[PDB]
């Protein structure tokens, strides 16, 4: 179907058309991550400007499936722009102990009332479920700590759950952000979604959960447990 803001808000469980404020941005970001799972399982059958936005919208919103970073963050960029925000696309290199290709991960920045926020509803692993300030200052979300440090002309998103040291998530160059950047974008299954107070992630057989900053992981053995976790992730919340 054709892109429709109202249909999209309904799909992620947001009522009405809330105003273009920081509180609205936080709510949209968290609802999107809870309702729209990351899922690369059929990413090959949809491969950036040469993929019409309506095809991705149809797959994710109209049909209710998940997607990957250059699908979910591309749709969310469009939604935020239609809702009145100053939104900019930026590419990142993912901590793979080394950082991978320099434009592997695509996400968004929003500039609002003199502050810049990171927006990412399309990263598979444990990462922030509400937008981060673009700041080295430490920020706290559901018991996890976050900061955006500066190292060697890169900003680096770092995360610290309970019982852990600081972990880099990905790194990016803020000055390469682009309001129109989506028009320029060039074997294991990853599936995840946010919960009310954390995130659940399945990579191959490896099941990861974080709740109030407390992490648990298990390599799944049984087929019925595997099926149950897939259903739990893909059902949304």
Active site residues: 69, 105, 120
- Note whether 94 binds ligand W0E by CB under 6 A: yes
> Which residue number has the CB closest to ligand W0E?
105
Collapsing DSSP to helix, strand or coil, 217 comes out as strand
Rg (CA), the chain: 17
Cα–Cα distances (Å) from 116 to 4, 109, 157, 191, in that order, read 26, 7, 14, 28
Number of H helices, E strands in the chain: 5, 13
Report the length, in residues, of the chain.
Answer: 237
Q: With respect to ligand W0E, which residue has the nearer C-beta, 103 or 111? A: 103
Measure the CA–CA gap between 203 and 196, rounded to whole angstroms.
Answer: 21
Q: With respect to ligand W0E, which residue has the nearer C-beta, 44 or 163? A: 44
Q: Which of residues 180-209 bind ligand W0E (CB under 6 A)?
A: 190
Contact pattern from residue 48 through residue 77 relative to ligand W0E, giving x for each residue in contact according to CB under 6 A and a dash for the rest: ---------------------x--------
What is the distance of C-alpha 25 from the center of its chain?
A: 13
Measure the CA–CA gap between 208 and 164, rounded to whole angstroms.
Answer: 15
Least distance CB 224 / ligand W0E (angstroms)? 26
Measure the CA–CA gap between 130 and 120, rounded to whole angstroms.
Answer: 9
Q: Which of 124, 181, 198, 213 binds ligand W0E (CB under 6 A)?
A: 124
Least distance CB 122 / ligand W0E (angstroms)? 8
Measure the CA–CA gap between 228 and 206, rounded to whole angstroms.
Answer: 14
Least distance CB 144 / ligand W0E (angstroms)? 18
- Note whether 102 binds ligand W0E by CB under 6 A: no
Contact pattern from residue 23 through residue 42 relative to ligand W0E, giving x for each residue in contact according to CB under 6 A and a dash for the rest: -----------------x--
Cα–Cα distances (Å) from 121 to 30, 38, 141, in that order, read 8, 8, 15
- Note whether 104 binds ligand W0E by CB under 6 A: yes
Find out whether 59 and 1 touch, Cβ atoms under 8 Å: no
Least distance CB 23 / ligand W0E (angstroms)? 28
Least distance CB 131 / ligand W0E (angstroms)? 18
Task: Phi first, then psi: give them for residue 10, nearest 5 degrees.
Answer: -65, -40
- Residues at the interface with ligand W0E (CB under 6 A): 40, 69, 94, 104-105, 124, 190
């Amino acid at each position: 179907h054709m892109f429709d803001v109202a249909k999209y808000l309904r799909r992620i469980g947001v009522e009405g058309t809330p105003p273009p404020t920081l509180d609205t941005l936080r709510h949209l970001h968290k609802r999107h991550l809870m309702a729209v799972p990351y899922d690369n399982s059929t990413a090959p059958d949809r491969l950036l400007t040469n993929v019409p936005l309506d095809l991705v919208f149809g797959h994710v919103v109209t049909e209710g499936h998940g997607g990957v970073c250059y699908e979910l963050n591309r749709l969310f960029h469009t939604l935020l722009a239609e809702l009145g925000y100053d939104v900019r696309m930026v590419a990142a290199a993912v901590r793979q102990g080394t950082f991978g290709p320099e434009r592997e991960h695509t996400f968004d920045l929003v500039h609002l009332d003199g502050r810049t926020h990171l927006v990412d509803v399309g990263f598979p692993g444990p990462s922030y479920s509400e937008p981060l300030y673009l700041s080295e200052e430490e920020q706290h979300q559901y018991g996890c700590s976050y900061r955006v440090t500066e190292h060697d002309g890169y900003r680096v998103v770092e995360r610290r759950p309970k019982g852990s040291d600081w972990q880099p998530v990905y790194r990016f160059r803020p000055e390469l952000a682009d309001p129109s950047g989506w028009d320029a974008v060039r074997g294991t299954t990853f599936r995840s979604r946010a919960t009310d107070n954390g995130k659940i992630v399945l990579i191959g057989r490896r099941y990861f959960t974080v709740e109030d900053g407390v992490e648990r992981t298990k390599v799944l053995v049984k087929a019925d447990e595997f099926q149950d976790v897939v259903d739990l992730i893909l059902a949304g919340a």
